[PDB]
Amino acid sequence: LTYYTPDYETKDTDILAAFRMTPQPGVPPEEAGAAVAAESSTGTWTTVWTDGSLDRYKGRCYDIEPVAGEENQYIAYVAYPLDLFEEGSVTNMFTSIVGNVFGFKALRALRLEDLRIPPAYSKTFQGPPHGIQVERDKLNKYGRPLLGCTIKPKLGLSAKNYGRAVYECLRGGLDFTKDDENVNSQPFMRWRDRFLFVAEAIFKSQAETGEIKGHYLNATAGTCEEMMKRAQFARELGMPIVMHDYLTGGFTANTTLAHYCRDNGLLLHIHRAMHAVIDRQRNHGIHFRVLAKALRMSGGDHIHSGTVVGKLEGEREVTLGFVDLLRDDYIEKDRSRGIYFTQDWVSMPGVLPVASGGIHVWHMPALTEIFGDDSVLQFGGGTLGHPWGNAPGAVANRVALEACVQARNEGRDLAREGNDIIREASKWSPELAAACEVWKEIKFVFETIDTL
Amino acid sequence: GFKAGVKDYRLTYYTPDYETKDTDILAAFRMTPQPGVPPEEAGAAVAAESSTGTWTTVWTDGLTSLDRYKGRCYDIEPVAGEENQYIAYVAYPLDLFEEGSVTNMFTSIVGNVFGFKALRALRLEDLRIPPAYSKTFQGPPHGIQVERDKLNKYGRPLLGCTIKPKLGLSAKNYGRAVYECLRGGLDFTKDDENVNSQPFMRWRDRFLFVAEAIFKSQAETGEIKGHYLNATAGTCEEMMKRAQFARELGMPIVMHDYLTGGFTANTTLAHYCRDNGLLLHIHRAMHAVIDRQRNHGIHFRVLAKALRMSGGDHIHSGTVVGKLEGEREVTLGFVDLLRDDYIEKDRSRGIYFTQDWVSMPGVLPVASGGIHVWHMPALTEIFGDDSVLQFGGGTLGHPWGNAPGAVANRVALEACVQARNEGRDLAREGNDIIREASKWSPELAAACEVWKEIK
Amino acid sequence: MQVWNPIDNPKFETLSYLPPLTDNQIAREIDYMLRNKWIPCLEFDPSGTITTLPGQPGYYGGRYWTMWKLPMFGCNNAGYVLREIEHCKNAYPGCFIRVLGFDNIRQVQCCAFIVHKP
Amino acid sequence: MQVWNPIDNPKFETLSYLPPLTDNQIAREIDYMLRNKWIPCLEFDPSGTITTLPGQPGYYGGRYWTMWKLPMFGCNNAGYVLREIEHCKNAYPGCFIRVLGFDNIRQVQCCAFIVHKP
Ligand SMILES: O=C(O)[C@@](O)(COP(=O)(O)O)[C@H](O)[C@H](O)COP(=O)(O)O
Numbered sequence A: 001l002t003y004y005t006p007d008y009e010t011k012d013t014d015i016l017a018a019f020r021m022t023p024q025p026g027v028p029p030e031e032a033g034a035a036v037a038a039e040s041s042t043g044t045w046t047t048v049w050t051d052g053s054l055d056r057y058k059g060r061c062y063d064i065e066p067v068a069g070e071e072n073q074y075i076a077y078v079a080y081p082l083d084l085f086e087e088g089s090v091t092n093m094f095t096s097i098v099g100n101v102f103g104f105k106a107l108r109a110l111r112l113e114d115l116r117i118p119p120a121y122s123k124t125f126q127g128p129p130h131g132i133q134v135e136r137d138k139l140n141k142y143g144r145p146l147l148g149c150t151i152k153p154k155l156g157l158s159a160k161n162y163g164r165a166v167y168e169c170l171r172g173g174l175d176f177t178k179d180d181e182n183v184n185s186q187p188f189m190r191w192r193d194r195f196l197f198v199a200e201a202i203f204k205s206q207a208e209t210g211e212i213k214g215h216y217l218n219a220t221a222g223t224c225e226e227m228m229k230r231a232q233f234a235r236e237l238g239m240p241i242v243m244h245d246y247l248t249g250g251f252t253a254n255t256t257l258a259h260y261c262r263d264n265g266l267l268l269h270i271h272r273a274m275h276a277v278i279d280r281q282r283n284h285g286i287h288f289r290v291l292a293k294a295l296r297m298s299g300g301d302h303i304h305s306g307t308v309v310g311k312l313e314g315e316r317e318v319t320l321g322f323v324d325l326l327r328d329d330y331i332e333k334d335r336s337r338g339i340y341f342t343q344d345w346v347s348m349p350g351v352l353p354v355a356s357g358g359i360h361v362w363h364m365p366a367l368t369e370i371f372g373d374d375s376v377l378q379f380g381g382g383t384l385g386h387p388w389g390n391a392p393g394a395v396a397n398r399v400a401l402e403a404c405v406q407a408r409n410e411g412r413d414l415a416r417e418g419n420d421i422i423r424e425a426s427k428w429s430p431e432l433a434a435a436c437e438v439w440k441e442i443k444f445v446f447e448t449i450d451t452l
Numbered sequence B: 001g002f003k004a005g006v007k008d009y010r011l012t013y014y015t016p017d018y019e020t021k022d023t024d025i026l027a028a029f030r031m032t033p034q035p036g037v038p039p040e041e042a043g044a045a046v047a048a049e050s051s052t053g054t055w056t057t058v059w060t061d062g063l064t065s066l067d068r069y070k071g072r073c074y075d076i077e078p079v080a081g082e083e084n085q086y087i088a089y090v091a092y093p094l095d096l097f098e099e100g101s102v103t104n105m106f107t108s109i110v111g112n113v114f115g116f117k118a119l120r121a122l123r124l125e126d127l128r129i130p131p132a133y134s135k136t137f138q139g140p141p142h143g144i145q146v147e148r149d150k151l152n153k154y155g156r157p158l159l160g161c162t163i164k165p166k167l168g169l170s171a172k173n174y175g176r177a178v179y180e181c182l183r184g185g186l187d188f189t190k191d192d193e194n195v196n197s198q199p200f201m202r203w204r205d206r207f208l209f210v211a212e213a214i215f216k217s218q219a220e221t222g223e224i225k226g227h228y229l230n231a232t233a234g235t236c237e238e239m240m241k242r243a244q245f246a247r248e249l250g251m252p253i254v255m256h257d258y259l260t261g262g263f264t265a266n267t268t269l270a271h272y273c274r275d276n277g278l279l280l281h282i283h284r285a286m287h288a289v290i291d292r293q294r295n296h297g298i299h300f301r302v303l304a305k306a307l308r309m310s311g312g313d314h315i316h317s318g319t320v321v322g323k324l325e326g327e328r329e330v331t332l333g334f335v336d337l338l339r340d341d342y343i344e345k346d347r348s349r350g351i352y353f354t355q356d357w358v359s360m361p362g363v364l365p366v367a368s369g370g371i372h373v374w375h376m377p378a379l380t381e382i383f384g385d386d387s388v389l390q391f392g393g394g395t396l397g398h399p400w401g402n403a404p405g406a407v408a409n410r411v412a413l414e415a416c417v418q419a420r421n422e423g424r425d426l427a428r429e430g431n432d433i434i435r436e437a438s439k440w441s442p443e444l445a446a447a448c449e450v451w452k453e454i455k
Numbered sequence C, D: 001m002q003v004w005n006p007i008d009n010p011k012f013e014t015l016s017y018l019p020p021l022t023d024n025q026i027a028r029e030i031d032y033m034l035r036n037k038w039i040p041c042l043e044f045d046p047s048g049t050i051t052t053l054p055g056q057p058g059y060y061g062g063r064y065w066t067m068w069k070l071p072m073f074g075c076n077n078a079g080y081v082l083r084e085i086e087h088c089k090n091a092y093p094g095c096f097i098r099v100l101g102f103d104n105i106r107q108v109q110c111c112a113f114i115v116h117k118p
């Protein structure tokens, strides 16, 4: 009746959010909606404490809908004034909206779904260091998706051996190479030698083929001083790109690094670790699209988006929606893909998506269709598990992609005629033939737990 | 030697008969797999994709010697009642971790295994840290005894209060209320987690006014007083600037948020606080998004152990009187995990492994959230005189003002302590002792009327 | 197993691993480009070496070429493009030749490939 | 439209874009120089390459040449200058030759152009 204004005309400088709620038996719905608004702001419906203007500092519920198909499920909408947030700080925003509403006992579960950030609040952030167009112009690569590979085994290899594999992999036809996310500095291998050996391998490989190559160097550390020390060396050597984990490291550290990278002209690659602890259940936690928006605001160039045919969960429509949210500039409302609000980015650069996690040659036609030529595809066991070696493995991966791109350009299908394309290509490639014979019947099909 | 192809995990990562060493890290998850997969394969899969393993056999492994860098599942126990639940146990070699980093330890155990398409849920329960990995950390800046020596307060729990719903206030009005509450008789005074720097109030002048109030309140009573100043920010240059200014004004304590800020910044702040001689107060926000549901997430007793090694002096722990038997045993156990030095195994209290801390300082627990005068003997008898009690609306709600509100709490606490130091039982007598003390103190009256008895 | 030859094996980016291209293939992409409304253009250069600098990330030498005439704005047939290529081949017979495309809405190129070698 | 040849097209500063110069043109500027009371001088060198340094603004290599004899002070006829050029051409037949001028009031040169190529 108070924290529930069923007519409030939302302004154009307000932040909006949408929760899904599971009330206890008996509690009326329009009563719980008003409790979420207050428990996320002041914590009262009376004026016993004010009389000190309030009102200009309180959130209000302005709509309620029932979820079709479920007898106990609702959607609540809440508006928040602009003067409640500090400019240029994601930590504050997260603390102010979600930091007490998930322990309310009168409820059984809660899940945040979407958020609308107005242009009057987005202009105070810096954003991605370079973007999409600038990186393509720097690397001089147009017309096709990029390729990459991760090194294995994880933990156990020395530095000379680590560098001997990068060269053979890089000399075969790939573009990028990466360190596992759990490789920082360990007794069996320290970082300052790995950097040097990787640099030597990169130079030797570049001099041979005649194209630009790179490798993502990990910069996660336990203190800020060490993290900043590990990037100045990479700047000194002339390497073009670095990597950082933003969920186990922090938002404060990620923002400091993004500023440094913008200042000194480097490229940033982000990894999403521990995220499955928050967004896997369909009735508790925070959806991944909110974290994607937060990262785009904080700063980054690449981001993992997941596959749909690998060893880890992921649905199609949902993915198609958030990928559009990540890359585009103006997005319209569409409830059939999980979009609740219209979003405007007022000229802010985009972010490249990345797909990785148990994939091989008999999966190219599909990937090439779900994602356009504006993504990066990674293959770790698909290159180092080839019956011959790392160079023969890399060549087989590039030929498949070239054949798929040519077939797409000639005006043929890809969902209906895909196996043929691969076969007609193995007829003239002695390396592609070997790979196809090893992984013919290896797929992953289970029941989805986070349907929609 | 190399055979390209795919194999099973239970062929190299399941060691039913393994004797653990004294430099190993142990874990314990509860799992619920999908229809089709036997339990053994599931356990083996977790150990593999968390130590050293992929999905299709690589050749670069015949030049590193495994059986020296791999994790192993060595026990699986079914859960009574449930039909598809089991407890697993994994062992991790010591050479897999970087010294002095909590970020690394977490990235490995919990990183990319809670999202496999062959499971439905997962939950981490406990961890055993060997005494050879802990000696590489610093721990809390000061501890328990050193802080008590610094403040010169013995024998009783400390008191505090928080500025409740009172935003949009100017700095001068904030300082006036702080001074009134401090002159009332309390010890500490908090802030508000959602207050860093906003158009209605910036931080420098708020710091100035609070510092002005503290000295003038201290002069009239001859006791040491303090106030927590929030230092959470967006970059690492702002946080350091605020900490340096707080040190320059000569304040004794600061405050930080460690779940939404990160581990790296928390470790940096702890190092600075140890170097320059300050106290650290830790607030836990957003924790309910992880540790609430019973079949997915991470239990709080692991985050407590991580906070103790990264560094801190105070931590929130919640109240334990509105619960019931059976429960509150977990809370009493993980309080002991925070304060003691040697904890033995006890399954009834939710302890899975024996933990030794080899001479590391303790952490003071904090209880808060809706409490008034009638609850004093219970809290005194449960926690003991090694905690901090925080009052909210029970101080600013007095009908006479803010200053008389603290006198009632002080009198009640002193009466409860005196009653305990005489042999009287604080559990059965309870409501009776408060009434006698209310007879010769007009402020305890007119407060024992707004708030009724227990039962 | 066989061994990839490391001696004197240069590559020229996109469509360099597939078998050699024919004139039919060539006049098939030019059409794909035209169907999406993009502006063609030609470039030539006598070398393909890449040079770096001591300590400047993101700087390389040898990325710019020489423009033939001007971008073919308002072109709706492919034939014209093929004639212009023969003119360029006749003019300078000791240089590489490349074909580009342009999108004015996102301000970025869209494709590039080689059609003549010395 | 036509295309400007980018291959093997060096230039030598002033008066290098106009059609080749004749001896009449040559003995026309020498007179213009003399009418304003300036001092002639000759210089020779076997190369014209320019070299830079990593991080020093305003430093280039290859700006100094070799002086023939000495500046012709107190010269009032052109003929003499033309004879001296033929002597220099006979002496070193595999070098460039330049003609300069000098103003002692502002302390600066006034003109320069090439008269012989290998
Ligand atoms: O560590 C790994 O398993 C990977 O390198 C894949 O290796 P393989 O391809 O060799 O299996 C990727 O990091 C995961 O895909 C991360 O998952 P997400 O993209 O969901 O973060």
Ligand SMILES: [Mg+2]
Pocket (backbone or CB within 6 Å): A150, A180, A181
């Ligand atoms: Mg990995």
